[PDB]
Design a protein around this ligand. Structure first.
Ligand SMILES: Nc1ncnc2c1ncn2[C@@H]1O[C@H](COP(=O)(O)OP(=O)(O)NP(=O)(O)O)[C@@H](O)[C@H]1O
Ligand SMILES: Nc1ncnc2c1ncn2[C@@H]1O[C@H](COP(=O)(O)OP(=O)(O)NP(=O)(O)O)[C@@H](O)[C@H]1O
Ligand SMILES: O=C(C[C@H]1NCCC[C@@H]1O)Cn1cnc2cc(Br)c(Cl)cc2c1=O
Ligand SMILES: O=C(C[C@H]1NCCC[C@@H]1O)Cn1cnc2cc(Br)c(Cl)cc2c1=O
Ligand SMILES: [Mg+2]
Ligand SMILES: [Mg+2]
Lengths: 493, 493
């Protein structure tokens, strides 16, 4: 019926109410696993359709490798071993050989890559799969953001040269930016991860960072690695080059998950419920006749013209429901645009429009109604949602040249740009010190989160940042390691 | 290389060579699990695209429920226990209780159906999901046909009346017939399973049966159940009806798996390799210029015409390879149509065509060449493939009124239409009597198959069948129970 807790009052309770009452998600009796209902799964299918079409242009092909992986394969690569789920029984009998569930597919796929790649004519090899993933997360589960079963695509490419591989890393990273910005209306920051946060198997890791303004937390939104020759040496992925010598392939891997849906909801949801970006909305426009014979047919005509134009449109002519009840029903579920067709408005040859993101109501003359004009309204809603979130995000990025500035901005829910010289020890120092001086909400503490700051990324584009002249390393033991770039640090999920 | 064992010489070795050398499938180090390579996964994606579009017209919506099910939930349904795969630990730590991997999702989904359905206004509820499934099969694994991990869609619907549910069962069954015939060029027989073979939770089970002529075996191709109120009583799926009574919902479920791909290959594959039905072929047409600047330009124009028409076309202009080498390359991989462009052909303003299913070669004048005319050729190939398979299947259905006729037809690789009076004891009698008198190939024996006759289905359409007057029950202990329909029996996978 309604959200009874405000987003600003208790973020975790608000989130639970919005994802369930919108019919997006239900809870389940295996901890950390969730049910994706139709309006929710539609968003992920929309991401799939867009991403598939974009990677097809790059020559990537979809495959399906198995869910199961042997201990022998997995151990070809300690740190992650507590998160692996093990199948050990069939029926009532122990298996002679326990097997694990897919936590990622490097060790499942790369023995095949070593078989399939024999010469440079076999390269590039670029494969993708849309799969479920299992990780027995130690951290508290969070619907969409951190689930023990989640859904993703993982792409794995092999190249004859580093230049080709480098180019794909940033091409895929741009596609992840386009998913967030063009489909989900969520702004991103591109950067590289620090040595402590990057994939241990990667030469370097790139990320799109996203930001949750309500509790001032970043979310790692998607990942694109250059693996160098680290895995090709591990798995003997070699080829005869055109120069007749044998070389190790250069590889990348990259993944994007249903975490996207959680970011979308946390960024755009409000105290009336879901707010769906038009390009992933299960229903983009709901038409509601206010209740007469002629009004019904014009309402049917409005429905049919939008449907013919490819707009996902619904006609809510339910009899036993008041107009206001219908308004709440579809606002709760996130429909971006409502058309109200009333008798008074029909007399003036017009209709009433209400946009979900701002609540604004305005009239449109029927002479200006069309599939194109309604699509233009939907694009305006998309642009406003993205622009509002980007303005909020940018206002919450603070340049913090010194520790007192850093901890102050962190405690007020900002992301911080700090002078940086790469060092695992410096990053650990910052994490421990900020954690000791941090404060966080009871809701965040209940969600298993910490007030500690961690590295989010080193932004790719440093051109707008101020001078590093005279700035000191945040880690006093490494004052002799002069800062030479800016890093983004903040609280995180 | 190429296929070096004939389909009629050693069926299981032929099958292994065709699925691997065509780049459809690779073997893997977990028993009963296989790698689906791009050209193979394309077939399943094509089935998904078609089936999704058709069930959308019915109001069915896609969802995703979890991979895991609790022990308590799994035992609510009231045999299969040895096939259940159990996760018992994460890393080194035992779980509090083991959790099972999805063998099917009745016990995962129906507790939610009971929560979600409360009024007749909540019905019908029609959900579908495209998922992986795990069953610890005791029978010998067979690529595609019987794998320990497999992929399917499962649909689960709830209705306020039996009439609505009945209609859906046969609507879905017709869609499965269309998948096999219109996409895969595989003929089917629709029928109802006997009491011994139907799903224990179902009031009745329908099936599309398919036939592998090489070893005279049926394959159950897809399943559509009417569950009645059996599960809604089990899970308390109830609704307030229009008359204010509380009533149990009527339910169906239905599933179709990647077994489809195995049937397609076993039916159409030949001694040169894969033979792809055009509507699921990763590449429908390969254009090969015979080597010259004019020929190169005309060949590119031929390619461009087909690409613009939406035909999946490749241009194989590889330089140092004989025509016959390229021909073998694409024949092995199953491409249904080859276009050869040589200077002598262009001097007669014609191109040379060669169809994969029959090997026929013929010329087409350039003035008759277009996207539409090539599509018509591809449709002709589809029709021929389906018609050939149907003719063979019908020739291998034998009306067997007496036991000597039955065992003769069975041992010669036919399906048998027998006078039938439903009885589990009669079905078991026929199974054990036929097993004792049966013969089968060494390849079938090595595949873990048997010569026993299984009930396949009672065909829905009995109108073309002979008179039952004066026919005798095959089971002498029930001689007083006169045959009242015809049943299809045969060897099976
Ligand atoms: N448990 C999870 N649930 C949902 N999405 C996830 C989960 N773990 C990771 N992802 C997402 O999947 C992407 C690729 O996964 P990966 O690089 O393995 O993540 P990661 O290093 O484990 N990150 P994290 O655990 O969030 O600190 C990440 O960038 C996340 O956006
Ligand atoms: N192990 C398997 N591998 C691939 N497809 C399968 C497998 N088991 C069943 N299927 C297919 O999935 C459909 C729905 O499954 P279901 O009704 O549960 O099969 P079933 O009763 O176990 N049949 P079967 O084991 O072949 O005798 C079946 O009609 C088959 O076409
Ligand atoms: O999963 C990765 C690296 C990349 N794989 C391809 C898709 C994108 C992704 O960033 C990092 N990672 C994360 N969590 C893991 C958990 C376990 Br359990 C294991 Cl064994 C391994 C891993 C592991 O490798
Ligand atoms: O899986 C079924 C019934 C139907 N489920 C929905 C899709 C279509 C399908 O025919 C039958 N079946 C088959 N094999 C099973 C194996 C195990 Br293990 C379990 Cl627990 C249960 C089952 C089980 O229920
Ligand atoms: Mg992780
Ligand atoms: Mg079975």
């Amino acid at each position: 019926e309604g959200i009874d807790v405000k987003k600003q009052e208790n973020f975790s309770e608000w989130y639970s109410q919005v994802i369930t009452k919108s019919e997006f998600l239900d809870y389940y009796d295996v901890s950390g696993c969730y049910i994706f209902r139709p309006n929710c799964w539609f968003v992920w299918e929309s991401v799939q359709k867009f991403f598939d079409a974009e990677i097809k242009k790059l020559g990537v092909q979809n495959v399906m490798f198995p869910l199961f992986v042997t201990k022998r394969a997995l151990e070809t690569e300690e740190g992650f071993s507590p998160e692996v789920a093990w199948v050990t029984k069939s029926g009532n009998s122990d298996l002679q050989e326990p097997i694990a569930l897919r936590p990622t597919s490097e060790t499942i796929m790369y023995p095949s890559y070593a078989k399939w790649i024999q010469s440079h004519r076999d390269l590039p090899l670029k494969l993708n799969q849309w799969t479920n993933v299992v990780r027995w997360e130690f951290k508290h589960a969070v619907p969409f953001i951190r689930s023990r079963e989640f859904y993703w695509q993982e792409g794995h490419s092999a190249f004859k040269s580093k230049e080709e591989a480098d180019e794909e890393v940033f091409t895929i990273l741009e596609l992840y930016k386009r998913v967030y910005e063009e489909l989900l209306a969520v702004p991103v920051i591109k950067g590289t991860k620090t040595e402590n946060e990057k994939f241990a198997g990667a030469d370097y890791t790139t990320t799109v960072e996203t930001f949750i303004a309500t509790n001032g937390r970043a979310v790692q939104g998607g990942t694109s690695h250059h693996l160098g020759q680290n895995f090709s040496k591990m798995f003997k992925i070699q080829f005869e080059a055109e120069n007749k010598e044998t070389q190790f392939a250069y590889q990348n891997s990259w993944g994007l998950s249903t975490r996207t849906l959680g970011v979308m909801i946390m960024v755009h949801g409000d105290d009336k419920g879901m707010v769906l970006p038009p390009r992933v909305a299960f229903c983009q426009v709901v038409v509601i006749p206010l209740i007469n014979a002629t009004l019904v047919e014009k309402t049917k005509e409005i429905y049919n013209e939008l449907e013919k134009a490819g707009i996902r449109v619904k006609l809510d002519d339910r009899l036993e429901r008041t107009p206001g009840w219908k308004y709440n029903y579809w606002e709760l579920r996130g429909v971006p645009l409502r058309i109200e067709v009333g008798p008074k408005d029909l007399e003036k040859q017009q209709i009433m429009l209400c946009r979900r993101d701002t609540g604004e109501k305005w009239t449109m003359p029927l002479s200006e109604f069309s599939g194109d004009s309604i699509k233009a309204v939907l694009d305006k809603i998309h642009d406003s949602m993205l622009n509002k979130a980007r303005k909020e995000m940018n206002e919450r990025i603070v340049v913090t040249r010194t520790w007192p500035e850093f901890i102050k901005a962190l405690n007020s829910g900002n992301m911080c740009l700090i002078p940086w010289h790469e060092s695992k020890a410096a990053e650990e120092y910052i994490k421990e010190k900020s954690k000791l001086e941090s404060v966080q909400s009871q809701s965040d503490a209940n969600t298993g989160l910490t007030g500690a700051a961690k590295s989010l990324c080193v932004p790719l584009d440093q051109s707008s940042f101020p001078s590093l002249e005279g700035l000191e390393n945040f880690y006093p033991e490494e004052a002799h390691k002069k800062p030479n770039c800016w890093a983004l640090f903040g609280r995180s999920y």
